[PDB]
Amino acid sequence: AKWVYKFEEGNASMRNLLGGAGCNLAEMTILGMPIPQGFTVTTEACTEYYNSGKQITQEIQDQIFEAITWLEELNGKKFGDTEDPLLVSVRSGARASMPGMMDTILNLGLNDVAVEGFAKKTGNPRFAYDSYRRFIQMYSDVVMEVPKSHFEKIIDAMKEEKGVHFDTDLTADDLKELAEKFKAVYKEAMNGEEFPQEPKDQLMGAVKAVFRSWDNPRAIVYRRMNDIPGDWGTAVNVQTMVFGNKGETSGTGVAFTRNPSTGEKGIYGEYLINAQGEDVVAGVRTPQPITQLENDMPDCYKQFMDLAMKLEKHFRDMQDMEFTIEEGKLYFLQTRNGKRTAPAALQIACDLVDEGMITEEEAVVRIEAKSLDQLLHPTFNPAALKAGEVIGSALPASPGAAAGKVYFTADEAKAAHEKGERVILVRLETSPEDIEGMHAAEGILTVRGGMTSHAAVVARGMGTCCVSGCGEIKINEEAKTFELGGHTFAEGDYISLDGSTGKIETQEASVSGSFERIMVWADKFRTLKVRTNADTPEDTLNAVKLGAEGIGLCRTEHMFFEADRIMKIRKMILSDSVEAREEALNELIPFQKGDFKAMYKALEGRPMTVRYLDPPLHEFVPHTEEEQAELAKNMGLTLAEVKAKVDELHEFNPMMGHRGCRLAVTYPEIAKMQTRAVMEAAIEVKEETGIDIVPEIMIPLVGEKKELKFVKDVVVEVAEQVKKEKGSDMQYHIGTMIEIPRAALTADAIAEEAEFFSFGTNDLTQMTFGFSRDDAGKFLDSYYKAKIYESDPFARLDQTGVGQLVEMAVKKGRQTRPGLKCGICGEHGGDPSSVEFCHKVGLNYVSCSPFRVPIARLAAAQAALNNK
Amino acid sequence: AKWVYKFEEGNASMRNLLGGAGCNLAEMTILGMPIPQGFTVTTEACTEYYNSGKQITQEIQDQIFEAITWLEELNGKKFGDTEDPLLVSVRSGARASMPGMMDTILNLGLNDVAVEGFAKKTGNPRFAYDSYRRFIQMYSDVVMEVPKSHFEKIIDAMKEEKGVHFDTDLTADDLKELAEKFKAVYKEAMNGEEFPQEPKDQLMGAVKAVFRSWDNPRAIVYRRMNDIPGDWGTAVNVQTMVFGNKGETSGTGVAFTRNPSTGEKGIYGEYLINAQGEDVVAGVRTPQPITQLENDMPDCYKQFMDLAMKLEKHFRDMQDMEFTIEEGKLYFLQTRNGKRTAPAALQIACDLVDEGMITEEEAVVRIEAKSLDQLLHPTFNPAALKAGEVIGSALPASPGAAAGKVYFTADEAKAAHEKGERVILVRLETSPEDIEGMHAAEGILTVRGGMTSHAAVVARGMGTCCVSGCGEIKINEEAKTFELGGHTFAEGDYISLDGSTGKIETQEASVSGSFERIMVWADKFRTLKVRTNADTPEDTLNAVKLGAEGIGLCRTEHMFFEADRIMKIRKMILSDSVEAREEALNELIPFQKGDFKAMYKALEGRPMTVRYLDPPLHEFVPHTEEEQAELAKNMGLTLAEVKAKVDELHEFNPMMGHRGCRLAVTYPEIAKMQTRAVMEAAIEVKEETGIDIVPEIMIPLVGEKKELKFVKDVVVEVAEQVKKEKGSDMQYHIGTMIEIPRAALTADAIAEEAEFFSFGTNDLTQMTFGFSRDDAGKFLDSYYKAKIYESDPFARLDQTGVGQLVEMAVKKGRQTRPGLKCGICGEHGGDPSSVEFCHKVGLNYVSCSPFRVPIARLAAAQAALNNK
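Predict the joint structure of the above. Result:
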């Protein structure tokens, strides 16, 4: 049993089973709501559909029917009864809400016999039929048997030759003609299959097409990236129909309790009169703004609002519902606290606490931790915008002010670099089969749509901008272009903004008191420290700004690379003799002394991990013959002598060769030069300010103990020899990167010569996996397609694999060195998961790129908050 | 008795008497602090000095001596005893802190006999003398008997010919020569008065010069504008000396507990080794950043810090102290929680609550309500700054990023328009006699100085930017110019920034979570509503942004003036016949319908007071002969016929003529046209959105009842006749401006035909005073000079005069119309006082310019908060 559940015979708690949808519905059902009863086909059963072959079976079929019967009686109507039918709606209820990505077949259990039978029962063949034309497009569409292109082309043309202003005036004859020519439109595109006229044929044909679509491309691609797993499932709540399509006193509306772009407490949404829920509000026929429902149905509004409210509170979070006035009767088809925008996700919480509703605690956990990233997107420059050729306007569909090249295909989008080449996507309307064009565009322009439309709604969560229902746009796909105002646009740089306008120079952007009360509270509840992996004080400033407690890694790589340090290591390398290689090394001495000084001077007491040189010598020599001709001359060496020397420098595998700690094992002069510049700069800076600075010296690529013992014995003697600026009291801890397998491995021995374990996770991952972030690109997607790897291994923390190497290390090095600090530097350093795994893992500090810090704040807030 | 008080024999509570200075000192004294005991000469006694003639007398003289004796014994040394003296410091302790504006004569009670006598007692003629040269400059300077120009010119030259690196190396001979040639430098500029060698002559000569300076120009000008009254007083705490000038183990430092520009929790400040407090830190010789006191005196730091801290808390607010290491001994000469910058005033409070220290409540009251204005200053455009020719750098002395013409005189500054023409002020160093150049400049550049310097410190409270100790600046006053980098600057547009650099395009600016937690809390504690006096939705947007609850006044003046409405009223006026004047009026009908629509559409439910036309017809006709030639032609009238008609339009007094409500008494068509556009726009807009809009119709200049009865009887019938867009349910309240004396007067009758009393305070003030804001300029300053009027009558709410007219009205109209809302529109609408007077006065709403709203938030927060 319990393959399927009843609304009333469930709860919201039962999510793992009853999705966000099916459980919230019952929830309402437990509260008592204008929801036509029904049932939900449970998650476990979805996965069971796969954990067996790929087609429905027994108990399930049994139950869909065992309970479909309970409905019928409970509903007195008969399921697909040709006389006086029973229609139903069939829509996807997974765990996590997924606006833009679901499936819902409307008015189901209808046929040529039973339409007519409804026709007579319903004293209105215009209604049931219009409904039947409806079901014809849907069922198919979902279960993909036809490209809407069609149905659309026949509905459209149908009116678009007769005269009919709009669909709402087509008659019982014309309609029935529509849904007549519709079966054949389904026919032609098919090999001759009866558009599932048996209700025990539409149903299963769909429930399966729900419990089976999931495992398909777009859903895999979306649901992946959305941090969802395929280990979960699709649900499908079936319930009786309610018809906002009955006529001119029955309507279908989308709504939200608090404006989801801004945060604005207040009813927000789009409604239609005599329209069919899952189809017209979300496209075709400018949808009446929910507030007008006072002018329109001033007996209804009260319903909905005190009902919305009631619910708003019942959950303590920004509700989103599918209400329907099925002929002067209110119905709540669906709910779920909609996914927000970054700011609004914020607003609502500050507010919700302000309103006594949430707690400082709750508020924090409640944010979509990875969503902060939006807060720091390049805003538009005021003085340019005005200098921007206004051409159009439309809809504040999703906050943002983007710009770039113009595409009319998501595939022409995506195939044009991710969300930064700058890809606009002009599109008549968007679809679940556009989901990858969605994720690689700065912002979207949509001809037909609103706040509730497909693209809009999706932008929001994508944090991507969008201007829906943007009319006057004669876009031609054939000739790959589009119109607007008085312009002709050929796929190139366009500008859209969260402020209606569809125009531009960008810039850094505010962070209201939301970020502040959210960040403020994060610090309150969070325990792991935060630091940024920086190199340039400019970021040190901008990073400290973000509630950065210092530096997790400071790179020296440039400290050579840079415009004037360059040919001095290039010297040393093309230089056989330590006294030469020291001379050389002694010349950059000054240079890096400055670098450090700036940093320090920036950091003022804030910690700072200084990682030792990483790249091998090879990275440090002109691969060109040109710069080689140069270099040579200036060396009094032969172009041939350098090449040769630029030849002995060749690694078959640059990642696993002569670099980092091993590098300063045969040149401990690197150690020398490096130690000193850090050592003197900190000393002098600790002087000229009276402020305290305790160099955190980092040996990368340490494989084993004895090794690091070598380099530390060097660094130490110089750092102790540098203290010639007073016998000194200068502080320093020599730590190491736990970025190699053996090194994480014998961690418990490793922490003998070391104070601080600094985790390199992108580099460790690349070891612990077997591939490199570089190479792997040419096969990674497959692992995605083939569902082998779910998350990105370079973004998201492999806690089954890599998480071990890191945990043997933390808890073993803390066997030998209890007072052992550990901090994470890898890209996964600021990762809503990582920063939770690292939190529960035992780490002390954190280290993300300058901007991912705020994600690291929340993350660590969440991390401990919700942890226990 | 009790003319003078003893530190120990006081408190901080006793402020009215013991200033912020004298009471905080004792406060410390009650806590036990490294403060050399002494006494304070009480406030009442200062005012007593004036409430009698202008020179010290009995009990006072008595007490200065009665207690100076208590010191001597208590201190065992002898006051001005030629052998083994007793020196003292003499410094101003008014109520309100006043960094930059005080007087403190150092090492007093010294003479040619007693210096020498100290010389021998002090085993160091270099010390006591250097001190004596010191006292010579000070006493005089304060008591103004010499322009520093001098002393400076002799000290300066003195070293500036001998070689001496700096003053700190001049000897007992050279010094004594300095303070020898110094008495004569005092002599020459004087008519032959002995530089007050009798200690009962330096003293009184100063205490009086404290209790007498106050009533002078700059202090009056500063203290006025600073919201201080002359009804208070100067104090003068006298205490024993401590000498940071003893030698190379005795130092003089300025400090703050939390960075006052940013808010940064942490020791912030400037110190000197062997320097004299009140003189070297605040100018000449780059002052060691307080933190270096660890490298310098790492036994001292601990003193100060745990002492600072101790105090930081003892007050629960950002401390500021005068510490002195009078030869290896720590001394706290002074305290006071320093005045902040707008952001930092903020930071510190958010923090202080964050730190458990203040309460949400306390935090609010604690802000300098009028200081918010800074938060909304034009920031610099990123893309221009980079495009800005960097020439220099220096000191983050006060946040801001200003720019404009360059001046080297405060008087050349001020005499060049206030803080917006854009006046830079390049100045060697600033002075109390620069205070008016300070208040009319965007930002300041200072050659010699630091965070602690005269100009810096003052900018902060002025919210004006400043870059002190900005070296390399060869500025020549003679030729009115200055150098920097590789440039030659002749008094024209320069650019300075709160970020070191001394460069530019500006723009709107952030509002961190401070403004937010401060604004958030304001709303929590505040009761009066807030609205903006707007006209253009653009501000309606930007205003709602600021926590604006609607509109207090909406002007129609432009709704005619505007570029295309213009010649249609100009029609109507040059048009004898109501049917013409209606035609005309009927043509603008549409136009204003839009205006309203935009507003409304902007406002979404937010209230909105719509004030009826104000200016007389005259304001509406070309005063030129040119536009007159125009107008004529297009009217088929003679240039002569218009003039004549433009002649009958002449008011001897445009403020008190034919305008506002009287205007639509002989043209009720204005009423008509006005009613309708508002009426239809609201109706239609209440339609096309389903949202609610209740026109608030405002009749300005209502003198009496029966009058407004006339206009309301019009407006009503049309607003009831406009409801032709449905028999309608359209809301509207007809209110009036309580801006005339009779109208405030018979308020109790006035509120018969009216729902809402809208106070016009700039226009009422102008009645209740007798002058006009226009005219009065040519004599206002005198009232200031002559101390007749303290505050500006057009800025600050005359609560003795005007406050009555407004209070008879509120509480009488609420006799006839209890449920009577009242809101304030005058400029004083958003006024940290007003918004308190209006609060305790009975008002309901508020109305300030778009940007003064946030001042209106706090104000109303404060208003009720602290009220009871």
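The longest strand of chain A covers residues 265-273.
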